[PDB]
Design a protein around this ligand. Sequence first.
Ligand SMILES: [Ca+2]
Length: 118
Amino acid sequence: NLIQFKNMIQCAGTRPWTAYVNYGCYCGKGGSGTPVDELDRCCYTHDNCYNEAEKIPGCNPNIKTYSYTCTEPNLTCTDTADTCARFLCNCDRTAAICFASAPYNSNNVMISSSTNCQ
Ligand SMILES: [Ca+2]
């Protein structure tokens, strides 16, 4: 669930989802080339993760609503029976934590056309 993902972001970190709407080569719609930094790699993994999520029967990363708890700055995925929800919550929680731990080089903000994003 895209809504849950952005709420899962401010739980683990300080930067809201808007800080990431367009950063590096992979944060934001689609993605190409090689990640530029640690954060961009966070996004790179998240995408490959959603791509994986689609290989799960009746599993759509945008709409699927999972279960999780936030004891700031702690995230916990409670699902264990529902694979999609489990796997999907996993993708988001990983990304959210990754984002908060990674640095934010405002320089790599909006370089989608630079030679770096092959
Ligand atoms: Ca992306």
